[PDB]
Design an enzyme around this catalytic site. Structure first.
Site: not given
Ligand SMILES: O=c1cc(O)n([C@@H]2O[C@H](COP(=O)(O)O)[C@@H](O)[C@H]2O)c(=O)[nH]1
Ligand SMILES: O=c1cc(O)n([C@@H]2O[C@H](COP(=O)(O)O)[C@@H](O)[C@H]2O)c(=O)[nH]1
Lengths: 218, 219
Positions: B65, B72, B173, B180
């Protein structure tokens, strides 16, 4: 949370040797490191314990938790088992998904940080328009720790207004993404900085320079 | 599109290697496509993908997800494909640049992106649902070919299928534990994702066989 120099290192290098070396080079300036999936997926969750062993720093696991409640619970459990002190959770998937994380954090003695609005341009498409409501949801749920965008100080200020002065707010997008350290600290308790430090010719000097620029705010 | 055996994808969310390997092995005659998420990866490491490939030769969808900024996102996709995942699931909510970052890595690395539009759980109604039609349209505009949508809201799943068109690949899912129905969901989805109904069953093979028997006319 008491963050040294109001500065959190975003350690997004993807190999253990470089990540450890660079963190070591700037260790005198920080006591809080944000570790995310770039490092964890490259080197394993054991890297969190290694950081605690070497640096005795606080660890925020930036995992942008964004699943259904049942899966969120599992992710938080695995994350805290690895020694993270806190975890970052998306607000977008709604209240039940956040609550699942809050429950595990309470059980294991950790903190949840709620990500409201993101810092990058794409945040304007969908997340920005929901961000104030996501923040109010955090308040309703008793969330005390928040993440909001350095790149939009007016939005960061609004987030601070919603959550109050008692809540804790950290903010990424400083440096590389265009956010200013000092302006961000008008509203956030701490700034998150990644590339401006870890891609710098001299990461220690980069960190020192940022801190110099906010000297009057410490 | 990927040829998913029996239109059934296992959501392998057990958190220890031994159980996850046991259950997956037990259902391998029914399922050649496994969704591995953070519950298992954060517990056992990215090498779990390697071990599943070695033991079962199943396709692997990394359900991460992905929901970060573009820079990143790129790093996450690179690490995930390096480990051998066939595909990765990316949130649409962070917008077009974040999705594009993932598409670019997938193209460069010869792998696939699945775009998560609306989610299946109750909290999805607060924010994601209202953006989901536009998130889907955005996916189509970006050239996304693979999508994820919710079994638990047939009306929403139907609409998402309309938006993406019949040629796009849609997995869903929320089947079983979340309420479902397998057959109903396959009116719109190419494949159903099933986790707990299989992996918590006393006999996961029997649980999988039962689901497949119930949708036999749709294969
Ligand atoms: O809105 C957001 C939320 C975040 O966690 N981050 C995270 O904060 C860090 C920003 O790093 P940088 O200073 O290199 O741009 C990264 O690890 C990014 O995944 C972001 O940049 N924006
Ligand atoms: O909208 C979403 C998107 C997902 O990936 N999932 C993922 O699908 C799987 C659903 O598993 P379950 O049949 O045990 O409810 C889980 O791995 C969950 O993280 C979900 O349930 N709803």
């Amino acid at each position: 949370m008491d963050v040294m120099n109001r500065l959190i290192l975003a350690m997004d290098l993807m190999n253990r040797d470089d990540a450890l070396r660079v963190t070591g080079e700037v260790r005198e300036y920080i006591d809080t490191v944000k570790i995310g999936y770039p490092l964890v997926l490259s080197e394993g969750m054991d890297i969190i314990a290694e950081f605690r062993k070497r640096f005795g720093c606080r660890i925020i696991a930036d995992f942008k938790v964004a699943d259904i409640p049942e899966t969120n619970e599992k992710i938080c459990r695995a994350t805290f088992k690895a020694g993270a002190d806190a975890i970052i959770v998306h607000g977008a998937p709604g209240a039940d998904s956040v609550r699942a994380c809050l429950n595990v954090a309470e059980e294991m003695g950790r903190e949840v940080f709620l990500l409201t609005e993101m810092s990058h341009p794409g945040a304007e498409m969908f997340i920005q328009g929901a961000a104030d409501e996501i923040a109010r949801m955090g308040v309703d749920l008793g969330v005390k720790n928040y993440v909001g965008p350095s790149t939009r100080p007016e939005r960061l200020s609004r987030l601070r207004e919603i959550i109050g002065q008692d809540s804790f707010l950290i903010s990424p997008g400083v440096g590389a993404q265009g956010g200013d350290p000092g302006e961000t600290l008008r509203f956030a308790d701490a700034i998150i900085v990644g590339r401006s430090i870890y891609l710098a010719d001299n990461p220690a000097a980069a960190a020192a320079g940022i801190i110099e620029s906010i000297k009057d705010l410490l």
